[PDB]
Amino acid sequence: AGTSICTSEEWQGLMQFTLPVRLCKEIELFHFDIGPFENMWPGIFVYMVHRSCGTSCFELEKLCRFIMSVKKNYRRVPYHNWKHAVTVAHCMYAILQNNHTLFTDLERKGLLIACLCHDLDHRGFSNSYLQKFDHPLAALYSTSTMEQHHFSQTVSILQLEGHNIFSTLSSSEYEQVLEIIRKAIIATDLALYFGNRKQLEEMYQTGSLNLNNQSHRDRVIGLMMTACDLCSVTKLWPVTKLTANDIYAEFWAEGDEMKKLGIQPIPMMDRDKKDEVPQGQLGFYNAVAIPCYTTLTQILPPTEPLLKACRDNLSQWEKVIRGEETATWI
Numbered sequence: 001a002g003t004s005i006c007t008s009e010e011w012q013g014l015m016q017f018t019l020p021v022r023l024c025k026e027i028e029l030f031h032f033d034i035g036p037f038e039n040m041w042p043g044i045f046v047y048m049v050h051r052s053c054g055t056s057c058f059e060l061e062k063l064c065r066f067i068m069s070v071k072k073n074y075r076r077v078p079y080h081n082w083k084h085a086v087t088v089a090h091c092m093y094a095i096l097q098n099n100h101t102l103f104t105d106l107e108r109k110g111l112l113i114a115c116l117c118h119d120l121d122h123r124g125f126s127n128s129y130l131q132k133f134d135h136p137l138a139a140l141y142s143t144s145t146m147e148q149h150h151f152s153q154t155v156s157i158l159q160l161e162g163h164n165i166f167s168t169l170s171s172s173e174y175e176q177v178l179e180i181i182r183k184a185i186i187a188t189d190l191a192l193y194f195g196n197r198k199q200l201e202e203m204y205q206t207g208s209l210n211l212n213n214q215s216h217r218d219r220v221i222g223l224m225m226t227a228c229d230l231c232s233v234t235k236l237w238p239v240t241k242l243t244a245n246d247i248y249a250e251f252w253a254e255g256d257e258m259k260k261l262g263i264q265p266i267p268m269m270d271r272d273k274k275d276e277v278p279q280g281q282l283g284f285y286n287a288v289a290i291p292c293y294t295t296l297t298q299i300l301p302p303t304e305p306l307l308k309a310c311r312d313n314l315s316q317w318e319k320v321i322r323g324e325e326t327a328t329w330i
């Protein structure tokens with residue numbers, strides 16, 4: 001498809017963006033929701049970046065270019081879209097703050113960028129779909145199909161004229177940050193998560209875990225990328241349930257495509273199977289989210305508010321199964 005260069009009229013306002021006061025305190029929190037501030041996201045990011053690695057961290061004329069160009073390359077799909085990008089990036093920021101001195105500037109800015117870019121050019125179709133129905137990309141990338149494409153897009157965007165914001169770095173620092181990013185994105189493939197989790201859990205429970213160990217570091221950033229990518233399970237109940245609607249909207253659309261070629265899709269992608277959602281969420285929390293956050297608590301205790309919320313949301317889902325489900329406005 002190629003990459004589309006953003007029009008020059010969008011960054012014309014962003015360079016002038018000043019952050020409202022009341023948010024300056026609110027942003028710092030884990031459960032904070034970007035939702036209500038759509039027209040502020042491009043600034044919310046900048047602010048987070050300026051706070052975590054200083055004002056002169058990037059060439060602001062090119063950072064503003066990089067962002068609004070990334071914004072364009074997210075499709076108007078119902079979930080894996082521009083809003084997801086910022087939501088995830090914010091959770092990174094939040095983690096990074098509560099663990100600031102554990103990471104290099106290179107790492108901090110590297111991650112923040114990777115987060116906003118982790119789902120670039122998402123078509124609203126999973127790995128399973130692209131691999132079971134030989135999409136060109138699956139033979140391009142046998143494993144972690146979409147994630148690899150996400151990376152190449154990020155790369156291509158940087159390579160375009162007036163985009164490279166890591167240019168002010170040494171060719172040694174460039175090789176590393178693009179790698180920190182490479183690994184960061186690839187880890188967001190849930191496939192790799194479970195293995196990664198167990199390892200980290202084993203390592204910790206045996207005191208093996210050391211963050212000066214480049215291999216252990218990779219894995220800790222790994223679980224970070226997973227924690228953030230799924231942080232919708234860490235927001236207050238009502239947001240959690242609305243975001244959930246966005247995901248199924250996208251899931252079912254894919255299911256609509258597997259029906260059009262004689263394969264009954266997994267219940268999760270079948271709009272005719274809504275009844276199974278609350279039980280289906282229980283599973284995902286118990287098998288994935290709780291593990292993800294419990295582990296991350298042990299490794300990084302200041303992240304514990306993420307787990308506190310997730311346990312609450314599971315507690316809410318159990319309460320939905322029992323029939324105590326509360327009001328919703330559709």
Ligand SMILES: Cc1nc2cc(OCc3ccc4ccccc4n3)ccc2s1
Pocket residue numbers: 229230232233247267268269273276277279280281283284
């Ligand atoms: C932010 C994300 N939420 C989820 C939830 C998932 O699970 C939802 C799920 C699971 C099993 C089901 C079985 C039947 C019906 C619906 C289901 N939904 C799977 C991946 C992600 S990423």
Ligand code: NI
Pocket residue numbers: 118119188189
């Ligand atoms: Ni993804």
Ligand code: NI
Pocket residue numbers: 084088118119188229
């Ligand atoms: Ni994602």
